Structures are given as structure tokens and as C-alpha cells.
Design a protein around this nucleic acid. Structure first.
Ligand SMILES: [Zn+2]
Ligand SMILES: [Zn+2]
Ligand SMILES: [Zn+2]
Ligand SMILES: [Zn+2]
Lengths: 199, 199, 199, 199
DNA sequence: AGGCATGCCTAGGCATGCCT
DNA sequence: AGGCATGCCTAGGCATGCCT
């Protein structure tokens, strides 16, 4: 009955884990991931590659959902949406609704969904197994507002929750990670890791 | 026949206990809990996470009720309500009556009830067992007046009484805690703990 | 066209002036007037005597009106009225609307008015000339909220505007003074006068 | 033919001048005017008193119009309006259209106009002469976005253009001043004045 | 990439009905 | 009458997109 999706890591029967690319720590790198914070730092609308790893191939018709929630207890109830400014700027690829924060690029079967009870947005693609001789598949996500956007995330941290779901909407696996969308992900990742260390 | 609900701790057959998050002692932290005082300090309308722990899962259709009473003997008879100012400020989410002090956020099955004999307000949600691999569930409560509100709590301390109730309104368990809603929960928790020590 | 009454002092052709009584400035005197601040300090609902002085007798049917406005430019446009708690206190004399800040006591011809355009409150009594060998007439006003009332004056200072008006509605004279309604008028007068002299 | 209003000062035959109130330049004063910069610094939606001074009294039916234009040549052609977040905040008084930057408060005859050719917004009140023994009349303007609002003024300076216009629409006089709507008017005024003198 | 911007987070300290 | 309460005013300093 909670309207807040769970964020609990659940590797599940198929051994579901996420993977992220080692990037530069240059000031304005487009996407970078901090293991220490379990946090992705990225620029608005740039490609954020996320690897899916499983120990065993899930059943056919399995789906991959991405949803954002505010991380802080104080904001968890609020639906993460795009700010009014970016919602009106007609940057849609034709598939993604202007209100949705998370897009998937380069997938012909993407679906953008809206929970009729919680009003929360999400973007779903079918799960595909890796090519023979590869260990993972990679989804290219895009975040369409900055963390700081007035009237949107308004500087609040979010978590992206990725779930592996069988065809019948049951939970196969869940992982999550924090996201900051910002102008200078390298600077900001360095600042946050140093702040963690300093205090 | 008493119009004052009981505050007596009753762990009961299911081992019912409350839990609270460790928070900053920063001056204006939004919510903080003092074990020495069994007292929660929080800001008006901010999220107050309350954990529910049971040794054994209660029967289905079990419900979780929250009710406020004045803590002092001198005031226990008086129904705790919102002050006239906040009652008229049209801040309702559409579900909570403007008169009710305690709200629950993020729950699709919340009910706001009113005792026909005592006129006391309460807010109820269905009990849900923890997710597999978690020990507790968490309810997000909100207190919609400061303790100091003129015409309302008027600087008097309250207790929140959480009861675990079976489908047929029988008591399964009961816990309670003091609450101060205030502008600077960190300062005020330090002051009260130090006052306890000094005298 | 402006919805804010003028406060401009206008003694007019009848020589219209206000006077105040000397009051012992004990910490909690019921009412005291500071000439240096042109400001009255009084307790909620206590008698505030205000003297009407005039060089020439006004024509029959002259009336005396009192209105409150917020003193500061930031609040001028907001109608001065009672806070929600004192509005529902059921303390009307059967004549004053429960929302009106200013009442007149001890007058068989008092009338309370609501401006249909500005929605501002005022209280009118007929002007009576002094008795032979008296120099002035006194009106007894009551202020039915503290300056600090939440949802009412909310610590903002107000002016009382006293107008002398003939039966045809012409302005014959106007005077004003600041008001603080508070628990300890003698203390508060002393504190503001001190603050005045340290500027 | 130009869609940009003229800002050219024109006191005209009635000696039309603007005046401003002396304000205390605390860090967050609500409104302050810098004569050296001819610039008002004010907080979002707070009262900005603007004095209208005139040597000869304008004819009946004279109106006072306020419009905003971007100050820099690079932005002059762009209509000044509210950002998308604030346009959708539902903060109208029931009279100002939600898109208009400039409101007039406390006037029973305000009208909000959209130019059918340029689409620029303006707000108009009737001109009222000063009361006898008064030297000027004051309008209370409000600005409903910060200069920094994303998707609105976006940190670009604007000018407020005040025109005195007869009922037939003749220009009787024109004055203007720069505006910054910001969180800390006293600070920001100090900083820009400092920057001016280091040049 | 260096460094400014500017709303906003923070703590010190005052307020003011009210307790003693 | 003395002195505490407690929401909130004040100033310092950080944020973070963006200018140079
Ligand atoms: Zn955005
Ligand atoms: Zn309240
Ligand atoms: Zn009141
Ligand atoms: Zn805006």
C-alpha cells in the first residue's frame, strides 16, 4: 500500500547486478560513476551506459524497468518529474513524454509508462541476453533535467531503481543507484567523495 | 468508559515495538528522536519515519492506528486538534481533514477517522509485513501544527499512541512516544535532554 | 481607486486633535501612550481611552470613525482583521462582528462597517461635543487581538486612523497613531523607546 | 513598426518624475533603490513602492502604465514574461494573468493588457493626483519572478518603463529604471555598486 | 579549466506570551 | 517584576550553471 517503490537490492534467482563504465574524472565529463557513493554523475540528456549482468539467463518476455525516486525520507513521497521549463521545450524524441525524466535511447521497443495509482513515471525495455562471448548487455539512459532544476528535482538527490521483471510483472531482480545530473560531473564527483572523506 | 485512550506499552503476542532513525543533532534537523526522553522532535509537516517491528507476523486485515493525546494529566481530557489558523490554511492533500494533527504520507489506503463518542481524531493504515530480508516496515507521519500553536496544542506536550489492531478492532499491541513539533528540533532536543540532566 | 486609506494628518478647519491619558508605566499597565513614538501600547481587549479635541464645534450629525491599517509598505494592502483563533472565541458583545479588530465600548450608537469595495473594517460613533467647561470628549476603544496573533497581525505594527466626518461624508479631520497590542505594554514601550534612542 | 518600446526619458509638459523610498540595506531588504545605478533591487512578489511626481496636474482620465523590456540589445526583442514554473504556481490574485511579470497591488482599477501586435504585457492604473499638502502619489508594484528564473528572465537585466498617458492615448511622460529581483537585494545592490566603482 | 553566480542552508540571537 | 519560551530575523558562507 506504500506509494513509494522499494529500493532494496535483490540479486534474486538470476544473480542480477549492475555495471558501470570506468570514465575520466575530468571536470565536465559527460557521465561518471562513483563506486564509493554508488552514485552516477552525468550531464543533462547525455548518454549514461548501464550494464546488466546476470548469472543465468532470465525467462523470455522479461522486462527491464527504470524509475526514479527522491532519495531522502523527506521527499520520497513526491513523484520525480521534469521541471516545467524543460517540459515545454519540445525536446522529445517523439516517444518519450515531455514530463518523463528518464529516457532510453537506441531501443526500438522502449515503452514509457505511468502508474495509475502512484502517478510515477518509468521507462521499460525488453531484456535481451548478451551476445555470445559477452558478459553483459548495456542500456543507454538519458536524464532530461539537472538535479538543480527549479520546480523539478530542485537540488534533491534521486535514486534510479532498475528492476528485472518477468512478463507477468513479478519481480526478478532489483538494483539502484543515486544520480546527480549536473553541468560538471567530474568536479561534483570529486567534491562529493572528498566531502565523504572529510566528514 | 474513560474518554482518554490508554497509553500503556503492550508488546502483546506479536512482540510489537517501535523504531526510530538516528538523525543529526543539528539545530534545525527536520526530525530527531531522543531515547532518554522517549520523545520525537520534528518540524511542522515534515516526514517523521516511524518503524514497526514485530517478532511474528500479525493476522491479515491488521491495522495501524495513530492518535495523539495531551501528555499531562491536566490536559488529557482535551481532544488534540489543529489550531484554527492551520485549519483554514487549505494545506490538505485532499485526504486528510483540515482539523487532523497527524497525517500519513505515501500510503494509498490511509483512512482518517473520528471517534463518535470521544471526538478524537486518528489516522489508520493497513499493516504490511516487511519485505523479505528486512526487519521492519516504516510509516511516514506528518504533524500539522507546532506544539506552540495558539489555539491548538498551545505549548502542551503530546503523546502519539500507535496501536496494532486486528480486523475486528481488538488490540494486538500498543506503543507510544512524546512529540514536540517545533522550529528547531535539534536545539530543542539538546535543551530538553540537558534540562533533564541538570534537574 | 487605491484600496489603502490615507493616514495623512489633517487637523482641518475645526482644529481636530487627539489626546492620550498619562499612564503609570508599570510592566503590565493596561494601556500607555508614547509621545516620542506616537504609539499606544495596550493589552488585548482592555480600555484604550482616546481624547477628541476640537477648536470649533463640528456640525450636527458629525461622526468619528476608527480603522486599522498595517504601517509597513509591505503589508499596507492587507486588510487588518482578527486572527482565526480569536474570531471563533465567541467574545462578541452582540454588536461587534467577531472579525473586527477595533471595538468601541460604552456607546449606545456604535456601528460596525465593512467597506463593500475594500472589505476593510471600521467602527463609528456619533461625535458629541464636550460638556460645558470640559475641554475634550473621550472614546474607549478595545483591540481584540495581540499584535503577535498568528494568522492575524502576526507581529506587524498597525496604525489606527481616526477620522472626523460630517453626515454627508466629507472629511473634516484625520489623525493617527501606531498601536502595539501585547502582554506587557509598559515593558514593550520602554524597550521600543530605548531602541529609538540607540539609533 | 519596431516591436520594442522606447525607454527614452521624457518628463514632458507636466514635469513627470519618479521617486523612490530610502530603504535600509540589510542583506535581504525587501526593496532598495540605487540612484547611482538607477536600479531597484527587490525580492520576488514583495512590495516595490514607486512615487509619481508631477509639476502640473494631468487631465482627467490619465493613466499610468508599467511594462518590462530586457535591457541589453541582445535580448530587447524578447517579450519579458514569467518563467514556466512560476506561471503554473497558481499565485494570481484573480486579476493578474499568471504570465505577467509586473502586478499592481492595492488598486481597485488595475487592468492587465496584452498588446495584440507585440504580445508584450503591461499593467495600468488610473492616475490619481496627490492629496492636498502631499507631494506625490505612490504605486505598489510587485515583480513575480526573480531575475535568475530559468526559462524566464534567466539572469538578464530588465528595465521597467513607466508611462503617463492621457485617455486618448497620447504619451504625456516616460521614465524608467533597471530592476533586479533577487533573494538578497541589499547584498546584490552593494555588490553591483562596488563593481561600478572598480571600473 | 579557473572562478564567479545567487538561491538557499546554517547558526547566533532576539522575540514576547507566559510561568514563577 | 524577573526571567524563560521559541518562531523567526539576521548575516556568513556554500551551491552550481555558466562566463571567460
Ligand atoms: Zn529541468
Ligand atoms: Zn497550528
Ligand atoms: Zn488574535
Ligand atoms: Zn520565475
Amino acid at each position: 500500500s506504500s506509494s513509494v517503490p522499494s529500493q532494496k537490492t535483490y540479486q534474486g534467482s538470476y544473480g542480477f547486478r549492475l555495471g558501470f563504465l570506468h570514465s575520466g574524472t575530468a571536470k565536465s565529463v559527460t557521465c561518471t560513476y562513483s563506486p564509493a557513493l554508488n552514485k552516477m554523475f552525468c550531464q543533462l540528456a547525455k548518454t549514461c551506459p548501464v550494464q546488466l549482468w546476470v548469472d543465468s539467463t532470465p525467462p523470455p518476455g522479461t522486462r527491464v524497468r527504470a524509475m526514479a525516486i527522491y532519495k531522502q525520507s523527506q521527499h520520497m513521497t513526491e513523484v520525480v518529474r521534469r521541471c516545467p521549463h524543460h517540459e515545454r521545450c519540445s525536446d522529445s524524441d517523439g516517444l518519450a513524454p515531455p514530463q518523463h525524466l528518464i529516457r532510453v535511447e537506441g531501443n526500438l521497443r522502449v515503452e514509457y509508462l505511468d502508474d495509475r495509482n502512484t502517478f510515477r513515471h518509468s521507462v521499460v525495455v525488453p531484456y535481451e541476453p548478451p551476445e555470445v562471448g559477452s558478459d553483459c548487455t548495456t542500456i543507454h539512459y538519458n536524464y532530461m533535467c539537472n538535479s538543480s532544476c527549479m520546480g523539478g528535482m530542485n537540488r534533491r538527490p534521486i535514486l534510479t531503481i532498475i528492476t528485472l521483471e518477468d512478463s507477468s510483472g513479478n519481480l526478478l531482480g532489483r538494483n539502484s543507484f543515486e544520480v546527480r545530473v549536473c553541468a560538471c560531473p567530474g568536479r561534483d564527483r570529486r567534491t562529493e567523495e572528498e566531502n565523504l572523506r572529510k566528514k
